[PDB]
Coordinates of all heavy atoms in Angstrom, one line a residue:
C134 N 1.2 -32.4 -1.8 CA 1.8 -33.0 -2.9 C 1.1 -34.4 -3.2 O 0.9 -35.2 -2.2 CB 3.3 -33.4 -2.7 SG 4.2 -34.0 -4.1
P135 N 0.7 -34.7 -4.4 CA 0.2 -36.1 -4.7 C 1.1 -37.2 -4.3 O 2.3 -37.1 -4.4 CB 0.1 -36.1 -6.3 CG 0.1 -34.7 -6.7 CD 0.7 -33.8 -5.6
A136 N 0.6 -38.2 -3.7 CA 1.4 -39.3 -3.2 C 2.4 -39.9 -4.3 O 3.6 -40.1 -3.9 CB 0.6 -40.5 -2.7
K137 N 2.0 -39.9 -5.5 CA 3.0 -40.5 -6.5 C 4.1 -39.5 -6.8 O 5.1 -39.9 -7.3 CB 2.3 -40.9 -7.8 CG 1.5 -42.2 -7.6 CD 0.9 -42.6 -8.8 CE 0.7 -44.1 -8.8 NZ -0.7 -44.4 -8.4
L138 N 4.0 -38.3 -6.5 CA 5.0 -37.3 -6.7 C 5.9 -36.9 -5.5 O 7.0 -36.3 -5.6 CB 4.4 -35.9 -7.2 CG 3.7 -36.0 -8.6 CD1 3.3 -34.5 -9.0 CD2 4.5 -36.7 -9.7
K139 N 5.5 -37.3 -4.3 CA 6.3 -37.1 -3.1 C 7.6 -37.6 -3.1 O 7.9 -38.7 -3.5 CB 5.7 -37.7 -1.8 CG 4.3 -37.1 -1.5 CD 4.0 -37.0 0.0 CE 3.4 -35.6 0.3 NZ 3.2 -35.3 1.7
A140 N 8.7 -36.7 -2.8 CA 10.0 -37.2 -2.9 C 10.4 -37.6 -1.4 O 10.3 -36.7 -0.6 CB 11.0 -36.1 -3.3
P141 N 10.8 -38.9 -1.2 CA 11.1 -39.2 0.2 C 12.2 -38.3 0.8 O 12.0 -37.8 1.9 CB 11.5 -40.7 0.1 CG 10.8 -41.2 -1.1 CD 10.7 -40.0 -2.1
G142 N 13.3 -38.0 0.0 CA 14.2 -36.9 0.4 C 13.6 -35.6 0.9 O 14.2 -34.8 1.7
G143 N 12.4 -35.3 0.5 CA 11.7 -34.1 0.8 C 11.3 -33.5 -0.6 O 12.0 -33.7 -1.6
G144 N 10.2 -32.7 -0.6 CA 9.9 -32.0 -1.8 C 8.8 -32.8 -2.6 O 8.3 -33.8 -2.2
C145 N 8.4 -32.1 -3.7 CA 7.4 -32.7 -4.6 C 8.0 -32.7 -6.0 O 8.3 -31.6 -6.6 CB 6.2 -31.7 -4.6 SG 4.8 -32.4 -5.4
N146 N 8.2 -33.9 -6.5 CA 8.8 -34.1 -7.8 C 7.9 -33.7 -8.9 O 6.7 -33.9 -8.7 CB 9.2 -35.5 -8.0 CG 10.5 -36.0 -7.4 OD1 11.4 -35.2 -7.5 ND2 10.5 -37.1 -6.8
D147 N 8.4 -33.2 -10.1 CA 7.7 -33.2 -11.3 C 7.4 -34.6 -11.9 O 8.0 -35.6 -11.5 CB 8.5 -32.4 -12.4 CG 9.8 -33.1 -12.8 OD1 10.8 -33.1 -12.1 OD2 9.8 -33.5 -14.0
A148 N 6.3 -34.6 -12.7 CA 5.9 -35.8 -13.4 C 6.9 -36.4 -14.3 O 7.0 -37.6 -14.3 CB 4.5 -35.6 -14.0
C149 N 7.6 -35.5 -15.0 CA 8.7 -36.0 -15.9 C 9.8 -36.8 -15.1 O 10.1 -38.0 -15.5 CB 9.3 -34.8 -16.6 SG 10.7 -35.3 -17.6
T150 N 10.3 -36.2 -14.1 CA 11.2 -37.0 -13.1 C 10.7 -38.3 -12.7 O 11.5 -39.2 -12.7 CB 11.5 -36.0 -11.9 OG1 12.2 -34.9 -12.4 CG2 12.3 -36.7 -10.9
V151 N 9.4 -38.4 -12.3 CA 8.9 -39.7 -11.8 C 8.8 -40.7 -13.0 O 9.3 -41.8 -13.0 CB 7.6 -39.5 -11.1 CG1 7.1 -40.9 -10.7 CG2 7.7 -38.6 -9.9
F152 N 8.0 -40.3 -14.0 CA 7.5 -41.2 -15.0 C 8.2 -41.4 -16.2 O 8.0 -42.3 -17.0 CB 6.0 -41.0 -15.2 CG 5.2 -41.3 -14.1 CD1 4.7 -40.3 -13.2 CD2 4.9 -42.6 -13.8 CE1 3.9 -40.6 -12.1 CE2 4.0 -42.9 -12.7 CZ 3.6 -42.0 -11.9
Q153 N 9.0 -40.3 -16.5 CA 9.8 -40.4 -17.7 C 9.0 -40.7 -19.0 O 9.4 -41.6 -19.8 CB 11.0 -41.4 -17.6 CG 12.0 -41.0 -16.5 CD 13.0 -40.0 -17.0 OE1 14.0 -40.3 -17.6 NE2 12.7 -38.7 -16.7
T154 N 7.9 -40.0 -19.3 CA 7.1 -40.1 -20.5 C 7.3 -39.0 -21.4 O 7.6 -37.8 -21.0 CB 5.7 -40.4 -20.2 OG1 5.1 -39.1 -19.8 CG2 5.4 -41.5 -19.3
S155 N 7.1 -39.2 -22.7 CA 7.1 -38.2 -23.7 C 6.1 -37.1 -23.4 O 6.4 -35.9 -23.5 CB 6.8 -38.7 -25.2 OG 7.9 -39.5 -25.7
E156 N 4.9 -37.4 -22.8 CA 3.9 -36.5 -22.5 C 4.3 -35.5 -21.4 O 4.1 -34.4 -21.4 CB 2.6 -37.1 -22.2 CG 1.4 -36.2 -22.1 CD 1.1 -35.6 -23.5 OE1 1.5 -36.0 -24.5 OE2 0.3 -34.5 -23.4
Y157 N 4.9 -36.1 -20.3 CA 5.3 -35.2 -19.1 C 6.6 -34.5 -19.5 O 6.8 -33.4 -18.9 CB 5.5 -36.0 -17.9 CG 4.3 -36.8 -17.4 CD1 4.4 -38.0 -17.0 CD2 3.1 -36.1 -17.3 CE1 3.3 -38.7 -16.4 CE2 1.9 -36.8 -16.9 CZ 2.0 -38.0 -16.4 OH 0.9 -38.7 -16.0
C158 N 7.5 -35.1 -20.3 CA 8.8 -34.5 -20.5 C 8.7 -33.5 -21.8 O 9.7 -32.8 -22.0 CB 9.9 -35.6 -20.6 SG 9.9 -36.6 -19.1
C159 N 7.6 -33.6 -22.5 CA 7.5 -32.7 -23.7 C 8.6 -33.0 -24.8 O 9.1 -32.1 -25.4 CB 7.4 -31.2 -23.3 SG 6.8 -30.4 -24.8

């Protein structure tokens, strides 16, 4: 998983979840 997407809880977050942009959230 890319470092900026790693979920400390465990797992690999989506970009929308992390960054909240129109581009990643469509």
Side-chain angles (χ1 to χ4, degrees):
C134 188
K137 285 185 152 95
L138 297 186
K139 295 213 131 187
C145 191
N146 279 316
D147 69 285
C149 174
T150 297
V151 177
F152 289 103
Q153 295 278 278
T154 72
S155 289
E156 195 63 16
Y157 297 137
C158 304
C159 196

